[PDB]
Symmetry: D2
Subunit: 315 residues, 4 copies
């Protein structure tokens, strides 16, 4: 009334799952945009039939034409590479995607600025905390209208693994991972709860040990690498996390979700994007929540931001 | 496969909303049982038509026959009075329902024992922490198969009021209210989080004050009384809370939900029911979670239990 | 984005269920407006807490102030009486509500015209086909922006009863009831299908007989009277039907739903509202579908319209 | 209570989407079984994290071990090839998959018979009407406990394309495609409705022409080939169709869904599987609905069955 138009800039693995989920949730019309000929049209056609099964009414079209960004309410950018040429799966590292994906963000930014400067933008392309700022710079959109995927996905993994040990509903575990989406992501032990209860109570009761949690933390950090080596760069959970973010915007849910956003002094950092809880509603990023980190937690945050900064200089 | 059978023992205000929600969620077949002639049949007929609008397939029938408890998978007991004769709305107090509702619990307990001893039982009738134990005693069901409504409802109010001030999604506020469902309910300030973050951070940031929270606590405790004086004994949110509990059981969600359950030493209390977080799944109460209360919080818990104990002696 | 504002003009039995369902479906902010003091505020407060259980974010407020119609995207009018003074339940007839409810529609129409002339209006108050046109006249809204409840509800009953006999999913039965919502509602036997198959195939196979269908038709026509005599004027299924209609508008689903709408020559009738399939989407009534009735079916349609016309002259 | 166990025998493109949708809908625990090492474990891990985003509690595990079929409530067989070696995309034909997939069905059948003879089986592997009977023969399961995917998917395409022309909600178009899932699928023009109304009324009103419908029929038959040539063998809509079928079984919805099932005289055919409306509920195929085809429609049905029969002799 009128339906949202959601343009998926990138129609690869994450793009495909997002289109599926958008139709399931009847969230809006979908454009699967890609530079690859034919493929987005095929995925769009396949996906469009699910309107019947889902009792939805969302158009799904493919596109190779950047001007289809015109009219977009939400733009989700997954365009780019998941691996660097010559690198084995064992040495997979998001940092190595920087020289492959940087020029793509600049190009897409220019098209967003021309065609849909008032759209809400979600950047996914890795290394995401670098790429989101690059796209912010070139798209010209306001700081409250662009975020990067990271924390919703990283914490989904931490929350899930803890829930398996404790035999509780996965979403009843809450947790914070901040700073950057990469190997220096900051897993804040102090900010884990189970049914709203400090995780430390469960540790005290010997229901999960500190050593078990350490292993879960390592597993969380290395989850993408683990999945890359088993199969592929992850896509199902990334897509679900992105759609949770987009839905909070579209429906004005005002969920607290950890995303990469422009810092303007929070944690002692400015002029850079980093992962922190934000509130997503109809006005985009309605609030940037600054966790009251202690000095040791802040030092870990600084290590994460330093990686983003290092790569930004290489970009 | 086969569909759950859910018997609503009591087809009044809460019963009606529960039947509506069960059909919306396609949770199982419903029996609206009541002692009142004709009424449950009328409500059942009205409600049954919503299967079409909801794309569900749940039978909804009315009953005046206790033997319809046979085959029940879940029994929800709302049977009883919401007010005592002669009392004004201003002096409404759940304690005064004790002499009206006690004999009803005994009667229903006998029918559950005969007809559906393996059912999962949710007791709602006030004063609920007294009534749930009375029904436990007379139904003979295992301790893991019977709970009382309280904390999900009480905390829904606290969570909601805080969310309104902070402009976040209501369910992103988490909170614990324990001990008893009544005027001595224990609102645990230390156990409030917003997006998994200690509420104290928001207080420190002057986004909500300690004085504002005090007023919200008072409002939470007095919410039922407020609604009684505006309209009626509450029913929509009670129904939704009950269905959240029943659904966690039926679908094995293993949600952490605060309910009245048999204490066997937790908080220093035995041989009594009280409100505490529990995990609800396919095996009923799968875990009783004991909050690691400090001495001052425990003293408040003791005050709540003392009220339940006092009335149990009067019953 | 921004959330729809849905004003329920009338906060009685149907109003209450609608508010509940709106929060369940997260459809928009809700105002429960009524002339009765305190009651709508109490219902609103109770209902608002269900945002937590439902993972929704819809405001629910009560109102006695007509100016709260300002800003409404959807207005649902249930204001008025369900029974006439002095009449027994056995002689309940929607026609007798005419002198009670006519002035109410005029009053509400004036307030809609002043405060929300661009809102989409759903009229429920009986006798609905008369009341909807009266409100159209006094509100001044376009013909595509106002409909009356009838056919979705009447057919939910027919569809449901047939589904019970045939042991199929209720919504897999499709059926048309047209003309007017009252005792001369036209049940079109030729337009019944089961899984898209003509009902006649099932009759031929002796899975349901013509005599059984006749009894189901009578039951359908007399369903409201049946429920009135068992309990009350129906409210759960009416609410669900209304919300199905409102949702199709709000989400641009373009569902085909039978509603009372202004006829401009369809079926040989003009200058009157009657029940017919329409398509509801973002532009309101996007299409009025005229069934290609045979002469005998049309004669029944004429009998229904004649009742609406007779009462319009009395109004 | 206890959760269903759903084993996906085949963890390729359709398997992946099914696992995603099962978690979205919280339908049961999932095993992604495949002969490929590592891949199913990677997909399972990725998918499992979506329990958090979806508020679900479904295990998702990978497997290379056939014995994990033990305990299965539902088994969905997508194992096998989507294309034949040496064939271009332009000459893609499901018939050519016969020599590649036949031995796979026999092998899987033996493992089902040993490990989960009481499971409900959905066969997807092409050519599906041949493969489903082969699996029936080797698994030994009852005729009411095994179906093949076809008609839900084929009709989703027809329904969708018509809905686009008529600007109505996709699922408000109903249609039947019977006989076989392949190039001789029978598109029954007489059995198309829109909002329960004969499509012929819309043709009479010049809202869609007979020539337009002919083009839509051709498009429907050739949809898989179209998607193969644009992208890949279809997977998103196949997955959604399969999950609609599985869900109707698991939740006892009793939906009418067109599937491949054992014919025992319907349409004059026995000892073969073919596509026809069936009712899916807790007892599996609860009803086989025989459309009362006219002689010309039956001749088309016979042509479809003849293809299945021809390939069965080659198998
Ligand atoms: N931030 C996160 O939490 C997170 C998580 C997972 C993956 N990722 C990243 O997301 C990105 C996409 O992952 P995927 O699995 O979907 O990859 P993919 O390779 O399957 O899809 C990427 C698509 O981008 C397309 N593309 C390239 N240039 C384009 C352009 N200019 N415009 C439109 N499309 C273009 C490619 O043709 C391809 O189809 C990768 O960079 C990956 O590393 C980020
Ligand atoms: N625990 C909680 O958080 C909570 C919250 C709200 C209300 N309540 C309590 O729930 C109860 C029901 O509230 P309501 O608003 O639905 O009340 P209600 O008066 O509308 O309905 C109660 C129904 O119980 C019926 N009844 C009486 N004896 C019966 C019997 N032996 N078997 C079956 N039915 C019988 C009555 O006829 C009536 O229809 C009250 O006791 C109320 O105080 C508890
Ligand atoms: N069209 C249909 O299919 C259909 C179906 C069922 C009921 N109905 C009709 O819907 C109407 C409402 O039914 P209900 O069960 O909700 O009745 P109800 O008596 O419970 O509620 C009606 C409410 O309207 C209020 N009211 C009176 N004047 C008002 C005004 N000027 N502004 C706002 N509110 C006002 C009353 O105070 C009352 O709370 C009745 O007329 C009933 O006959 C229509
Ligand atoms: N009936 C229908 O309407 C319909 C529609 C679309 C596709 N299909 C068919 O479904 C099948 C699967 O399609 P897809 O897109 O998922 O193909 P896919 O190639 O992506 O996946 C098939 C999987 O089967 C696996 N496999 C092979 N042998 C196996 C065995 N013995 N046990 C377990 N797994 C085994 C492969 O390793 C592969 O991962 C194909 O035969 C396709 O033609 C049917
Ligand atoms: O960035 C990624 O690839 C991830 O974490 O899924
Ligand atoms: O017990 C009650 O009445 C309540 O809190 O709603
Ligand atoms: O109009 C009514 O009262 C009904 O049909 O529910
Ligand atoms: O069988 C197929 O490949 C299809 O129709 O999607």
């Amino acid at each position: 009334a009128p339906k949202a138009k959601i343009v998926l800039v990138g129609s690869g693995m994450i793009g495909g799952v997002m289109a599926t989920l958008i139709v399931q949730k009847n969230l809006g019309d979908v454009v699967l945009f890609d530079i690859v000929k034919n493929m987005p049209h095929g995925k769009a056609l396949d996906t469009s039939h699910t309107n019947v099964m889902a009792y939805s009414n969302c158009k799904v079209s493919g596109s190779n034409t950047y001007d289809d960004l015109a009219g977009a309410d939400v733009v989700i950018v997954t365009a780019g590479f998941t691996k660097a040429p010559g690198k084995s799966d064992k040495e997979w590292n998001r940092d190595d995607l920087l020289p492959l994906n940087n020029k793509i963000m600049i190009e897409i930014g220019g098209h967003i600025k021309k065609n849909c400067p008032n759209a809400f933008i979600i950047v996914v392309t890795n290394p995401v905390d670098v790429m989101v700022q690059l796209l912010h710079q070139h798209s010209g959109v306001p700081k409250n209208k662009i975020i990067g995927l990271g924390g919703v996905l990283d914490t989904s993994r931490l929350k899930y693994y803890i829930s398996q040990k404790l035999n509780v509903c996965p979403r009843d575990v809450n947790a914070h991972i901040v700073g950057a989406h990469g190997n220096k992501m900051v897993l804040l032990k102090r900010y884990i709860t189970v049914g709203g209860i400090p995780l430390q109570e469960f540790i005290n009761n010997k229901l999960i040990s500190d050593a078990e949690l350490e292993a879960i933390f390592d597993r969380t950090v290395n989850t993408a690498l683990e999945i890359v080596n088993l199969h592929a760069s992850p896509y199902v959970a990334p897509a679900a996390a992105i759609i949770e973010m987009a839905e909070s915007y579209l429906k004005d849910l005002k969920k607290v979700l950890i995303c990469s956003t422009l810092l303007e002094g929070q944690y002692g950092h400015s002029d850079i994007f980093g992962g922190t809880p934000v509130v997503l509603g109809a006005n985009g990023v309605e609030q940037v929540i600054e966790l009251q980190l202690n000095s040791e937690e802040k030092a870990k945050f600084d290590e994460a931001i330093a990686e983003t900064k290092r790569m930004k200089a290489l970009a």
